Structures are given as C-alpha cells and as structure tokens.
Design a binder for this molecule. Structure first.
Ligand code: FAD
Length: 311
C-alpha cells in the first residue's frame, strides 16, 4: 500500500486563495459529528481526542488553518449572549480523513481542573469547549466558524523545499495535515520530493499522538522524512534534566542551521510555554556559530521562513 490514496474532489486544488471567515460567529454553520475517539493511553496525564466533523463540503479549508467552535450555553460573563469562539487547528487535509472533501478533523486536549492541594477535580472549573468536544457522540451538532489563519499555510511554490516542524501536544495538528498531503494523498499538482522533519514533544509514550501514522512515513519515505520524539517524563537530557524539544533541536543544531541557511521553513505549534526554552537554545547555537540570533531571526521572518502559532 505504498501507493498514494485517491482523493476527491480535485476541484479543491483550483482555489487561488484560501477561504477565510466563510462563516462568522453571528451565523455559524451547523456541522455534524461523525466520530470521536481517544488518542492516548492510560498513562497519559490527560485525555486528547480525535474528532471527525461532517461539514458536507460547505466549510472548505486549506492545510494549516483553524476552525472556530462555539460551545452551547450562555456567556458566563455576558448573560443571554452566546459563548465565545474557541479556535482549533485542523488536523486533517482539505480532503479529510475520508478522502472525500466532506469532513474535517480536530485534535482536542481535555482541559480539566484539579485543586493543587487536595488534588480533586472540580467539573465547574473544567474547560467548556474542550470537554464539550471530547464528550461528543456521532450525530451531535456543532456550531462551526471560520476557517481562519494564514500563518500556517503550507508554502508549496517549491515542491522540494525543506520543512522542519516542531510541535508539543496538540500542536501536532497542522503537521498531520501537511504530512498526509506530502506523502499519503494522490495530489497530481503537488508531488513532494523535499525533506520533512517532524519533532514531537509529549509527556510520555502513552501521550504520543498519531505515532503509528508518522512511523509509517519513515518506512515508506526514508529519504524524505525524519521523525524525532521527545518524551519529557521518560527521557533525560545530557545534564540529568527533563528532556524537552529544544534539547533535541540542540542535538541536531548544526544540521538545522545549515538547512535554515539553505532556505528551509521552520514551524512551531502547540502550547506557548514551549517557546521561551526554544528561543534560548536557538540563541546559544546562533552565537556559537558566530552570529546574532536577533539578526538571524529578523532575516528568517523577512524571508518568510518563520512560522509560529502557539496558544
Ligand atoms: C490558533 C489556535 C489554535 C488552537 N488549536 C488547538 C488544538 O488543536 N487543540 C486544543 O486542544 N486546543 C487548541 N487551542 C486552544 C483552544 O482554543 C482552547 O483555548 C482550549 O481548548 C481551552 O478551551 P476550553 O473552552 O476548554 O476552556 P475554557 O472554558 O476557556 O477555560 C480556560 C481554562 O480555564 C480553566 N478554568 C476555568 N475556570 C476556572 C477557575 N475558576 N479556576 C481555575 N481555572 C479555571 C479551565 O480548566 C481551562 O483550562 C487553540 C487556540 C488557538 C488560538
């Protein structure tokens, strides 16, 4: 099955610009849930679920964009008014998990609150939209807005470009979409022949997301895909400290900077708390090479090689 999967409808490749704000909070699109499944094992710190939504082709999007979801209920801050929209990176390609251009998928981490002293959960303080989504069942309706976002659109001008993707937790979402388009789907107008390098940081092996899918790419395209996993609570860096993504980046610092100097695109997606540590590491490596990171970063942004979407 090393052959690419047929996708339809191909007219989704005809759009010159990505759709933006097709639906707004004022009048959202009522989509329907197809399936919801847990992506993690028993040892994971929290639950992360995969949700497939049927939009019937009414809310098309491009890889890297986000869907807005308006949970039911009233705005706890504004009685009578609807809940605020919560954004979620789309984890599927424009064709969707069913390869028919009718569905989109979300990768959602259940936000739960535990009292730091007693350690007991308090449902009244849990995340409204994330729990609403992972508690959903087939047939349930969901209010969708968007799509939104242009920061994470995939640069396709060069089919042989290099893309270095760095994610933590649910930040892997857009990359699942990128990778399916690059290696799984039969898209005649985009034949990827460059290098895709995915770095994924999670708590432990039971918290890995879509591992079987990414591992399959390693076996099928050894010369075009690299995959490095970082399990914070199971691995230690060269110092006895907890292993984080920036530690793995430092290990490949020489090759990564060579690729960046060569025009590679670098992406960061996931929880914002991941950036401080990465920035410090990149700064150190840059100065080691004799360069000012502030100046190199300014150049990367000017060249449109720097893509960041954290939350
Ligand atoms: C561009 C973008 C992309 C995103 N992509 C994803 C994605 O792919 N996957 C994903 O899971 N998320 C993603 N998010 C985050 C998502 O939009 C939500 O912020 C997240 O799901 C939490 O929403 P919520 O409705 O569950 O929680 P909210 O109800 O908004 O609550 C926020 C937090 O407050 C806590 N809280 C509430 N009341 C109290 C209280 N009294 N005391 C203490 N704590 C309290 C909740 O437990 C929760 O952790 C993205 C955000 C952006 C901007």
């Amino acid at each position: 099955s090393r052959s690419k999967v047929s996708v339809a409808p191909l007219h989704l490749e005809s759009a010159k610009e990505p759709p933006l704000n097709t639906y707004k909070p004022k009048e959202p699109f009522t989509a329907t849930i197809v399936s919801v499944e847990s992506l993690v094992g028993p040892k994971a710190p929290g639950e992360t679920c995969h949700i497939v939504i049927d939009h019937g082709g009414n809310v098309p999007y491009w890889e890297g964009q986000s869907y807005g979801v308006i949970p039911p209920g009233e705005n706890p801050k504004k009685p009578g008014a609807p809940q605020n929209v919560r954004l979620y990176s789309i984890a599927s390609t424009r064709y969707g998990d069913n390869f028919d251009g009718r569905t989109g998928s979300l990768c959602v981490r259940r936000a739960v609150y535990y009292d730091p002293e007693t350690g007991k959960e308090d449902p009244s303080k849990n995340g409204v939209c994330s729990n609403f989504l992972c508690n959903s069942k087939p047939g349930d309706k969901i209010q969708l807005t968007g799509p939104s976002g242009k920061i994470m659109l995939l640069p396709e001008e060069d089919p042989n470009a290099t893309h270095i993707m760095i994610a933590t937790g649910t930040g892997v979402a857009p990359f699942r979409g990128y990778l399916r388009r690059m290696f799984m789907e039969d898209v005649p107008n985009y034949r990827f022949g460059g290098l895709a390098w995915l770095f994924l940081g999670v708590a432990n092996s039971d918290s890995l997301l879509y591992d079987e899918e990414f591992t399959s790419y390693l076996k099928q395209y050894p010369d075009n895909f690299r995959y490095d996993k970082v399990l914070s609570r199971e691995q230690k860096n060269r110092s006895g400290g907890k292993m984080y993504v920036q530690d793995k980046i430092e290990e490949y610092s020489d090759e990564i900077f060579k690729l960046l100097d060569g025009g590679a695109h670098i992406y960061f997606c996931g929880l914002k708390g991941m950036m401080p540590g990465i920035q410090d590491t990149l700064k150190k490596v840059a100065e080691r090479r004799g360069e000012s990171w502030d100046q190199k970063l300014a150049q990367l942004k000017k060249n449109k090689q720097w893509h960041v979407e954290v939350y």
